[PDB]
């Protein structure tokens, strides 16, 4: 056998050359184009080649395959057989077996006048099953900038009626203008004329061509892709008979209680028809003596108390203030905080962002009609040319800002981050105007003719939203849209308001200034914040009535809170003013003791300031929110104690022989155990709630506890002496409630029928509270921490309403992986031979789910790109032979050879030291138009290299995006599921211990990691606080466990009802809600203690009599003192400006106050009358 028609000497026109006729044997390869034989069709390279082929024939094939390569090279499985067809058809070694020339003529040589017979025409025997398997397996490849078939662009007609026989017919016809001579295809499946066609092996979309080349994608082939995945959504509600299954367990329990209750009462009606005294008694006497002493030594007492106030409050010189949100909301040693510490160290901190959500309200959508063919494509309002020019104008102006800080000027470019610098230094702006490179000329220039545009800006936009990594539009315009900074701009990052793929329908425009974030540096951060400030001012003053802008900055949240923090000190001052007003008229009844109420207010403020100053000495920094929420509480408690004491005196009649001190010592000795109980119970409650792991609540809890304690001490010590002095003083001229409680309230409340109803109702309300308990929210809106008139609220609305992508995720594979071995690469490898459970694939599957996991997009892994880059076929890498230096893809090609030898073994992955050997050059590669993206703009950060010891690779990450996250529930779910994915990979890797592990990092993880344990944190915190109250109570009241247990049960009821009110007003259970509850459980005692004390220390006859006597006596003091005063304070706070106060402090305090009032003044009377300890 042998080949015919060797060489190409004739010429038709332009470059078309007719192959010369030669029917001799095939002339082996000239040894010159071994590379061509390898790249064009290696099926022939097993060296004795004896191939009929020619290097100029190979290079003219290669030259003709330019555009078909561009379109059909997307799915190698197809373009492989097409190449298999041309190479064999041209210079296969058995060329005589499937070919027969028909038309040939002499070819006169203008060099020698020697006639060579060109091959004008011949027949080519093609199997039927070959053209059918080729067209049918490659016919699904879609075209770029459209969802059509690439055959629509290669048939010369719609890919809808290009028969499989017709397209090849069109390809072989010289009528197109490309075929140098027409070839008559013969589709015979059997040898005819002794001539049998040939069809070498073929591969379908259900198979890969090479053990390193992946099969065609289901984007371009319909048969490879079957049913999508879906997770099972479990609600896991019990729902006993249709409803919450708690609405019922409770209603059932309540009915049982109500039946056993009216079933005991009604039945009863039918039937009718040294061990304890040794520690307290010494306390009353001691306190009387010390009060008498202090009343006769006022100078010394007041002097020592002022000395104390000053010595402690002079520490205010060291007052810090903490404003960095991380410090506020994150425990210094939390798992998420440690992960952030490790990530900030190896890859540098996450960058800053200045967003801009532009919108065009005054415009309607318009239609774009592609000139050659196709369906109508609608464009959103903001994609108007006029609106695009104005937005470009705004962006170019936003770029000019160079705010000056510390007599130095920082430009926007200087602060932004440029991945590939100092080669390219422009900086990252992620706007759809980067597709046109922020150039009016590039945006305006049209590629059309009269009364039509051939190509246009919309068309250009259409091509690269499809393929954002091109270096030219390559479609009748030939202009790149990679971006001035260098690196793709993904369309889902720059648009919003479209429908799930139709970037044509985009309604909003997204724009971003990423700014470098610095690790242990403050001058640069100060400089960045000064620039962001100027950015905000400019954007705030920019008018442009055609646009509705939503903007934001990295330092804007802190500014909003520092902005709101200071516009309500006027609220605390008004609160204090109203408290003093009430105190002046209520303190006893010129019968006014106002000089002393003012003294009490000053003592209280003294206690607050003293607490701040002592802790400043200690080193606790101020949060400025506490410095604002602390005074109200401390005022409440201090005023509550002052009234108790003053009123027992006002209601006291002087015995037979007491000057003044004797009476006051007697009154203080009879009142101090109770006041002391209330103060100690509250101090301990606060301090113990100061055990949680959160610096804001931790620090606040400490501050408040210490302030309350110091306030109690100073108040008992400074005020009893001053009260003695005033009492000498008030008289020389220089109750109506008690009547009510005794006269109509105590008797009424204690009737025999109203009492069972009250107890039933209160246990029912508690039953309801326990029923609706597990429906309480978890988390903070993140939108309510801002004032109402703020632009950040509008920005949050805009985000939730338009954005389609969320915060970036980094899946940091910790240090310790190999990366230089087949298996070490297979465990991570997002590819062919590496496991099917590999890291990148697992993250890909998670992103394929997308709701049972809130991870929206593919990993965009760097190692897959590195391998694609290093493949010999790409040929991007090229080193010098003697210097071992990286030859750029644009280079004179003097003597630099391919990195990997171009053989069957060299195609494989670089497993040994070559891996590392070529990796640095990859990370140093730039975006060459002939090569591609290169690996420097995207992975320099993502890859760590450790010098020496085999040059082992450092920690690396694979960053993916979250889904649009709108609510706290959404953030917590995202955290949980990222941890789940990381946990799976960590478990599957099977480490011989725990030397290292994968973990995900996102920006909000530090702020939202507490809600993975807040429930057990709250449980522990409340249980311990209540046990502490119990113990303190069972100790101080003597040892009568019955009174203490009763008080504890009442306070537990108060807390449960607090949770019910929480659910009812839509307050969430975060660490602020939790701190306020642990505090309320300590403030409730303030109520429940006096009454119970008045009951215990009583010597009347019946239980009912003791309860009523206690009610009259102490509740006359308790209703006017604690309740009304707290209520006035809260009603003043009800008009807030920070939202956080007005929601949580106001609602929680109103609830806590009114609940304690009702409980104390009503349910305690009755419950005590029923089950109080006899004596």
């Amino acid at each position: 056998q042998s080949c015919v028609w060797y060489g190409e000497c004739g010429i038709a026109y332009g470059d078309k050359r007719y192959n010369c006729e030669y029917s001799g044997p095939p002339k082996p390869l000239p040894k010159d184009g071994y590379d061509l034989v390898q790249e064009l069709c290696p099926g022939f390279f097993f060296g004795n080649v004896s191939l009929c082929c020619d290097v100029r024939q190979l290079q003219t094939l290669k030259d003709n395959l330019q555009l078909p390569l561009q379109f059909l090279s997307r799915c190698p499985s197809c373009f492989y057989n097409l190449l298999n067809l041309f190479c064999e058809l041209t210079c296969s070694p058995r060329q005589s077996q499937f070919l027969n020339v028909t038309a040939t003529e002499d070819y006169v040589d203008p060099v020698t006048n020697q006639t060579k017979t060109n091959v004008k025409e011949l027949q080519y025997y093609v199997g039927q099953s070959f053209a059918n398997a080729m067209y049918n397996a490659c016919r699904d490849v879609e075209a770029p900038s459209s969802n059509d078939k690439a055959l629509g662009l290669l048939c010369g007609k719609d890919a809808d009626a290009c028969n499989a026989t017709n397209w090849i017919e069109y390809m072989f016809n010289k009528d197109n203008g490309q075929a140098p001579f027409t070839i008559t295809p013969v589709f015979s499946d059997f040898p005819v004329h002794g001539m049998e066609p040939m069809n070498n092996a073929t591969k379908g979309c259900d198979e890969s061509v090479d053990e390193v080349t992946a099969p065609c994608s289901c984007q371009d082939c319909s048969i490879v892709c079957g049913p999508k995945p879906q997770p099972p959504p479990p609600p896991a509600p019990w729902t006993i008979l249709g409803l919450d299954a708690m609405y019922v367990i409770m209603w059932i329990t309540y009915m049982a209680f109500l039946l056993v209750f009216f079933g005991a009462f009604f039945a009863v009606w039918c039937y009718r028809k040294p061990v304890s005294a040794a520690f307290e008694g010494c306390l009353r006497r001691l306190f009387t003596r010390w009060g008498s002493f202090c009343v006769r030594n006022p100078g010394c007492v007041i002097f020592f108390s002022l000395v104390f106030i000053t010595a402690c409050s002079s520490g205010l010189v060291f007052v810090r203030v903490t404003t960095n949100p991380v410090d506020l909301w994150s425990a210094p040693s939390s798992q998420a905080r440690l992960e952030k510490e490790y990530f900030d160290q190896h890859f540098g901190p996450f960058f800053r962002t200045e967003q801009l959500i532009i919108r065009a309200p005054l415009t309607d959508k318009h239609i774009y009609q592609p000139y050659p063919s196709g369906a109508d494509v609608p464009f959103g309002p903001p994609l108007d040319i006029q609106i695009l020019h104005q937005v470009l104008d705004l962006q170019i102006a936003i770029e000019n800002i160079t705010a000056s800080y510390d007599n130095e000027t920082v430009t926007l470019q200087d602060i932004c981050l440029a991945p590939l610098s100092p080669y390219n230094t422009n900086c990252t702006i992620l706007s759809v105007l980067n597709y046109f490179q922020n150039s009016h000329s590039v945006l305006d220039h049209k590629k059309g003719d009269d009364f039509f545009v051939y190509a246009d800006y919309h068309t250009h936009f259409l091509y690269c939203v499809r393929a954002p990594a091109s270096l030219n539009d390559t479609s009748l315009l030939h202009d790149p849209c990679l971006g001035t900074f260098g690196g793709p701009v993904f369309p889902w990052l720059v648009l919003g308001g479209y429908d799930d793929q139709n970037y044509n329908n985009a309604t909003a425009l997204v724009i971003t200034f990423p700014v470098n974030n610095y690790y242990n540096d403050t001058e640069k951060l100060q400089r960045a914040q000064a620039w962001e400030k100027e950015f905000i001012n400019f954007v705030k003053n920019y008018k442009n009535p055609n646009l509705t802008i939503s903007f934001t900055a990295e330092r804007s949240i802190e500014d909003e809170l520092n902005r709101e923090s200071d516009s309500d000190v006027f609220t605390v001052v008004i609160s204090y003013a109203i408290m003093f007003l009430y105190i002046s008229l209520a303190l006893g009844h010129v019968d006014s003791k106002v000089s002393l109420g003012i003294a009490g207010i000053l003592i209280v403020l003294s206690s607050v300031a003293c607490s701040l100053g002592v802790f400043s000495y200690i080193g606790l920094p101020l949060t400025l929110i506490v410095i604002e929420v602390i005074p109200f509480l401390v005022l409440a408690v201090g005023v509550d104690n002052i009234f108790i004491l003053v009123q027992a005196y006002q209601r006291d009649e002087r015995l037979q022989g007491e000057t003044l001190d004797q009476q006051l010592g007697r009154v203080l000795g009879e009142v101090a155990p109770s006041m002391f109980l209330s103060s100690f119970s509250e101090t301990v409650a606060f301090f113990l709630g100061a055990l949680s792991v959160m610096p804001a609540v931790h620090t606040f809890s400490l501050f408040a506890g210490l302030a309350v304690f110091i306030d109690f001490l100073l108040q008992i010590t400074c005020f009893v002496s001053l009260l003695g002095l005033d009492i000498k003083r008030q008289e020389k001229n220089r109750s109506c409630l008690f009547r009510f409680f005794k006269n109509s309230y105590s008797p009424l409340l204690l009737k025999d029928w109203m009492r069972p109803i009250v107890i039933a109702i209160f246990v029912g309300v508690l039953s309801f509270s326990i029923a609706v308990l597990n429906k309480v929210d978890i988390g903070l809106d993140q939108s309510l921490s801002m004032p109402d008139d703020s632009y950040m609220v509008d920005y949050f609305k805009s985000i939730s309403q338009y954005l389609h992508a969320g915060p970036p995720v980094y899946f940091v594979l910790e240090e310790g992986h190999d990366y230089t071995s087949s298996k070490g690469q297979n465990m991570v490898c997002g590819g062919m031979g590496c496991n099917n459970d590999s890291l990148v694939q697992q993250i890909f599957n998670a992103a394929q789910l997308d709701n049972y996991t809130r991870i929206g997009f593919a990993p965009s892994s760097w190692i897959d790109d590195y391998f694609d880059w290093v493949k010999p076929q790409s040929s991007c890498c090229r080193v010098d032979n003697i210097t071992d230096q990286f030859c750029n893809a644009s280079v004179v090609d003097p003597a630099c050879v391919r990195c990997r030898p171009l053989t069957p073994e060299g195609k494989q992955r670089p497993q040994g030291g070559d891996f590392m050997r070529f990796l640095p050059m990859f990370l140093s590669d730039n975006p060459n138009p002939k090569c591609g993206k290169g690996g420097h703009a995207a992975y320099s950060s993502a890859v760590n290299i450790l010098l020496g010891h085999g040059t082992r690779v450092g920690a690396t990450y694979f960053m993916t995006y979250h889904t649009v996250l709108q609510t706290s529930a959404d953030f917590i779910d995202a955290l949980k599921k990222a941890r789940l994915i990381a946990s799976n990979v960590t478990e599957t890797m099977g480490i011989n211990g725990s030397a290292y592990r994968v973990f995900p990092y996102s920006v909000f993880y530090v702020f939202y990691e507490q809600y993975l344990t807040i429930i057990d944190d709250t449980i522990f915190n409340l249980g311990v606080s209540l046990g502490a109250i119990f113990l303190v109570t069972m100790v101080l009241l003597g040892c009568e466990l019955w009174s203490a247990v009763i008080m504890c049960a009442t306070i537990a009821m108060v807390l449960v009802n607090m949770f019910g009110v929480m659910w009812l007003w839509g307050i969430s259970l975060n660490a602020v809600s939790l701190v306020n509850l642990v505090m309320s459980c300590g403030i409730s005692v303030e109520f429940c203690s006096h009454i119970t004390r008045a009951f215990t220390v009583s010597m009347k006859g019946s239980r009912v009599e003791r309860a009523e006597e206690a009610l009259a006596h102490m509740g006359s003091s308790v209703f006017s003192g604690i309740t009304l005063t707290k209520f006035g304070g809260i009603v003043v706070l009800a008009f807030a400006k920070s939202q956080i106060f007005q929601i949580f402090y106001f609602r929680m305090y109103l609830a806590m106050v009114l609940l304690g009032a009702t409980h104390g003044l009503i349910f305690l009377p009755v419950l005590l009358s029923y089950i109080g300890p006899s004596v």
Binding site: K157, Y371, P372, S373, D449, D450, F451, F452, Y454, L476
Partner: protein, 132 residues
Amino acid sequence: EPVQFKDCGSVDGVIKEVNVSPCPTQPCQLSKGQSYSVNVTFTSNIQSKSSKAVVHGILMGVPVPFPIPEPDGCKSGINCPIQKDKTYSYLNKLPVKSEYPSIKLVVEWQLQDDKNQSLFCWEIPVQIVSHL
């Protein structure tokens, strides 16, 4: 109907009207496998003994030659020899054949005289439509 056209340089004639039938909307959509009739109202600026009709179709900015059955305008309603300053309107009719694609395009029309100067030159964009 009189259709909008772009004059590519009528030097040896003056177009008075261009009437294409049937063409109700412009660009006039011409369904495949269907014959259309052209009327071309023009004022001649020169005297030409002969007349050769020329048709050029431009796709994607590139001109394509289209041969017509008849190359002379005198057997299409033109009285040869052409006398100066007389106004004559050329009437044609041509059938749209099948196999043609459903495009949009620009018809280019020239009329060369004896000296090879176009008596009229106009261009008009028409889109090949389907069944519809």
